[PDB]
Amino acid sequence: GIVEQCCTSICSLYQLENYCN
Amino acid sequence: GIVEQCCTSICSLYQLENYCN
Amino acid sequence: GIVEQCCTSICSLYQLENYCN
Amino acid sequence: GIVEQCCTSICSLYQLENYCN
């Protein structure tokens, strides 16, 4: 998930945006 | 300025991008 | 809502727990 | 202390509460 995807390596704004709603 | 624009109104990330560089 | 309840009054951690899950 | 107890591994709310007052 986001912790898996964005904590081992940076997420762009667009990548982070997959977790909106 | 940024304080005058974004502390009175909410500024989105696209507005804020104009103060980068 | 949470903004309406906790930005007008201070909300403790027990109040806030009701918006978890 | 808290840095010893809560930075090598997560502290619950109750664990953190030992450091109140």
Added chain:
Amino acid sequence: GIVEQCCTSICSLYQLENYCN
């Protein structure tokens, strides 16, 4: 107090240093 002094006026880091220890 610190809230009464630094939430009404802006407090610099030198003002704030007086509430350390």
Added chain:
Amino acid sequence: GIVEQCCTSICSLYQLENYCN
């Protein structure tokens, strides 16, 4: 730079101050 100087090891207030202006 600051990331090089202040993320591998703590910077004092005075050290951080080199990056003001």
Added chain:
Amino acid sequence: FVNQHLCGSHLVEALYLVCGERGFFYTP
């Protein structure tokens, strides 16, 4: 408006800590 934007930021912060493994939704 701003008042509440900034408060929202602290609220998510606090919900993060409080909710634990529950997690949470936030909408403005």
Added chain:
Amino acid sequence: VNQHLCGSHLVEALYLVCGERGFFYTP
């Protein structure tokens, strides 16, 4: 601890990028 701390930056970043929409978060 390192990922609890990252999570906390993540929600803050979500808060801003998501806007009106809001977001969901679970660890």
Added chain:
Amino acid sequence: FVNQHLCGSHLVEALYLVCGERGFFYTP
């Protein structure tokens, strides 16, 4: 009330950085 709750959060933050090895008490 909220104004000051949120300011308190920044204040602890700033006292953290400023006080260093001194540390600090905070009460609301």
Added chain:
Amino acid sequence: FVNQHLCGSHLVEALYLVCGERGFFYTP
């Protein structure tokens, strides 16, 4: 005055995330 000091803190935070490798200047 305080209102804006505290908002500035969130603004730098947001500029940090948004600007990426650009970076930014901030002045009050």
Added chain:
Amino acid sequence: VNQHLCGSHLVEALYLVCGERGFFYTP
């Protein structure tokens, strides 16, 4: 640096969980 950064999250978390009582912190 890793523990200075953790400390900063710690005080914030203390600020919220302790409430009226407040707290004490030393590194």
Added chain:
Amino acid sequence: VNQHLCGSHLVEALYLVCGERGFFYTP
């Protein structure tokens, strides 16, 4: 990620220590 997170604390610390002057930041 560890340095992106440190950066975020850095700017906050800069914001406070620099005051009227402000600061510049680049990663």
